[PDB]
Amino acid sequence: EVRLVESGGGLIQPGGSLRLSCAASEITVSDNYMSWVRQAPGKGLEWVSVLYSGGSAFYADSVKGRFTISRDNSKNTLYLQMNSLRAEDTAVYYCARGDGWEPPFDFWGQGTLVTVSALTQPPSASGSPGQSVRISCTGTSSDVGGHNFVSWFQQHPGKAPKLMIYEVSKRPSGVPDRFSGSKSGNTASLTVSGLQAEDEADYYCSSYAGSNNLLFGGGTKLTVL
Amino acid sequence: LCPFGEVFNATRFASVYAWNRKRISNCVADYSVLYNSASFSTFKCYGVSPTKLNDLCFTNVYADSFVIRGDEVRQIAPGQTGKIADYNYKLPDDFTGCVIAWNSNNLDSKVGGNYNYLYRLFRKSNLKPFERDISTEIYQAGSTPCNGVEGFNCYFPLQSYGFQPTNGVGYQPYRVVVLSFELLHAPATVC
Ligand SMILES: *[C@@H]1O[C@H](CO)[C@@H](O)[C@H](O)[C@H]1NC(C)=O
């Protein structure tokens, strides 16, 4: 079975240290782009780090110099060593396969909570059952408007994000074709048609932004009324 | 006169994964004229100066050329990492020579996308300096063998850039020429 299973976590005081694990099955960590993505409670997604198949590592500006990504090929496990922790590192930490733009975050772990004591989306949207809703994501010419490395994620409460659209308009296998991605100028749009109760969820856009910067939108809560 | 025009003004450039190398020899090279020959957006020499290159002689000069994204030109320098440095074209840490680049949107982008320019996205390990990998075997990203069949965890290793004229500047194509200066136990032929 394909699995990513995080472990480690808990409560740390500022200046403390913690190491997270992500044990993979079927996916081979040493052969893949492997990343950590985090989500502060009640907030949006933030890319943290990526480890390349060849060993190169890259980090978000917020964690560079404090966190270290690594792996043990014999245990098929990815690690995140988190030093000099601050209150703002509080988040559910997810591992995921991909670098978030090429290739996209297609497969995700379950998340684990760590507690230490841009793209513009509308905060909310609604539509009626069987009808449609358009979720917008406004960037600049150096991200959404400069290339096609835009993804969309659906996230239900207590679950990891799920890749719904990559490369502006491509759907991963199994995603219903009533989820449709597009882009006009600097604004990407997720159109959900045939709306069903289960579409109630938060939706995030993502875009590569150059210089190994990966951007996430702030999230849109979709209500089906 | 060294045939630099053949390199810099070639109609087509190589894909970075299949980067082209031209050997230049038995000729006089004026690198000040080269420097001032066009508006290059990058012209960085390591350990040498183009003005001082004019008073040196070499056994051979090598001109490596290819196309990458604007955002990737910084990877064509000693000590760098990323998809281009790691899996496509690698300069050595002790690189001596020059790196020259310029926006090539007018030549290498197409309405609808130019998919002829490719780079390697999947590779088990990093390239050694000046190594070239042109294999295209389906890439096994999981425990299940692929047997040449694309699918889940089984990837064609090269990706197209798909350059479009409306791309942002950082995602537009840039033509790159790397000059390496070789000294063998042999007569000098490029002065
Ligand atoms: C390339 O062509 C232009 C225009 O024909 C010329 O000015 C330039 O010197 C050429 N470059 C080289 C390196 O010969």
CATH code: domain of residue A82 = 2.60.40.10
Residue with tokens 């760590």: A114
The structure tokens listed for A155 are 């996230």
**Interface contact flag, B141 A210, Cβ < 8 Å:** no
Contacts 24+ apart (CB under 8 A), B71-79: B71/A210, B71/A211, B71/B170, B71/B171, B72/B174, B73/B41, B73/B42, B73/B101, B73/B174, B73/B176, B76/B101, B76/B176, B76/B178, B77/B44, B77/B46, B78/B46
d(CA B25, CA A76): 50
DSSP result, A133-170: EEEEEE--TTTTTT-S-EEEEEE-TTS--EEEEBTTTB
Cβ-Cβ contacts under 8 Å for A197 (sequence gap 6 or more)? A129, A224
Q: Are residues A99 and A154 in the same domain?
A: no
d(CA B125, CA A25): 21
Contacts 24+ apart (CB under 8 A), B149-153: B152/A173, B153/A26, B153/A27, B153/A28
| From A26, A32, A146, residue closest to B168, measured CB to CB | A146
Which parts of A95-138 fold into alpha helices (H)?
Answer: none
Domain endpoint, select from A57, A82, A116: A116
| The length of chain B, given as a count of residues | 191
In a domain? residue B136: no
Report the chain B residue with the minimal C-alpha distance to residue A144.
Answer: B168
The H or E element spanning position A94 is strand A91-97
In a domain? residue B190: no
The structure tokens listed for A8 are 């480690």
Phi, psi of B187 (to 5 degrees): -60, 145
In a domain? residue A224: no
* β-strand pairing of B139-140 with B154-155: antiparallel
Q: Are residues A35 and A9 in the same domain?
A: yes
Q: Are residues A34 and A68 in the same domain?
A: yes
DSSP 3-state of A29: helix
In a domain? residue B149: no
Residues B61, B21 contacting (CB under 8 angstroms): no
Phi, psi of B73 (to 5 degrees): -60, -35
d(CA B10, CA B37): 15
Residues B95, B75 contacting (CB under 8 angstroms): no
Please give the distance, rounded to the nearest whole angstrom, from the Cα atom of residue B8 to the centre of ligand 1: 7
**Interface contact flag, B81 A141, Cβ < 8 Å:** no
Residue A202's DSSP bridge partners are A155, A221
| CB contact burial B115-141 (16+ within 10 A = b; e otherwise) | eebbbbbbbeebbeebebeeeeebbbb
Number of helices followed by number of strands (H, E) in chain A: 0, 20
- Structurally, chain A folds into a number of domains equal to 2
Angle of CA points B74, B80, B83, to nearest 5°: 80
Cβ-Cβ contacts under 8 Å for A221 (sequence gap 6 or more)? A123, A124, A125, A201, A202
DSSP 3-state of B44: strand
Q: Are residues A128 and A111 in the same domain?
A: no
The structure tokens listed for A184 are 């006009």
- Structurally, chain B folds into a number of domains equal to 1
d(CA B176, CA B113): 20
Q: Are residues A151 and A98 in the same domain?
A: no
d(CA B13, CA B117): 9
DSSP 3-state of A77: strand
In a domain? residue B114: yes
Domain around B19: 4-120+160-182
Domain around A170: 124-217
Q: What proportions of chain A, in percent to the nearest 5, are helix, strand and coil? A: 5, 50, 45
In one-letter notation, the amino acid at residue A138 is T
Domain endpoint, select from A89, A116, A143: A116
Cβ-Cβ contacts under 8 Å for B98 (sequence gap 6 or more)? B43, B44, B45, B46, B48, B50, B53, B178, B179
Q: Are residues A194 and A158 in the same domain?
A: yes
In a domain? residue A86: yes
Q: Are residues A112 and A129 in the same domain?
A: no
Q: Are residues A7 and A108 in the same domain?
A: yes
Resolution (A): 1.9
Half-sphere exposure of B147 toward its Cβ, with a 13 Å CA cutoff?
Answer: 2
Q: Are residues A95 and A152 in the same domain?
A: no
Residues A80, A69 contacting (CB under 8 angstroms): yes
Residues A216, A91 contacting (CB under 8 angstroms): no
In a domain? residue B189: no
- CATH number, domain at B73? 3.30.70.1840
Number of helices followed by number of strands (H, E) in chain B: 5, 9
The structure tokens listed for A163 are 């890749």
In a domain? residue B152: no
Q: Are residues A105 and A151 in the same domain?
A: no
In this structure, the residue with its CA closest to atom 11 of ligand 1 is B5
Q: Are residues A58 and A82 in the same domain?
A: yes
In a domain? residue B76: yes
Report the chain A residue with the minimal C-alpha distance to residue B127.
Answer: A54
Report the chain B residue with the minimal C-alpha distance to residue A210.
Answer: B71
Q: Are residues A77 and A177 in the same domain?
A: no
Please give the distance, rounded to the nearest whole angstrom, from the Cα atom of residue B50 to the centre of ligand 1: 17
Residue A12's DSSP bridge partners are A116
d(CA B15, CA B88): 9
In this structure, the residue with its CA closest to atom 5 of ligand 1 is B9
Half-sphere exposure of A149 toward its Cβ, with a 13 Å CA cutoff?
Answer: 31
The structure tokens listed for A147 are 């290339």
Residue with tokens 């295209």: B136
In a domain? residue A35: yes
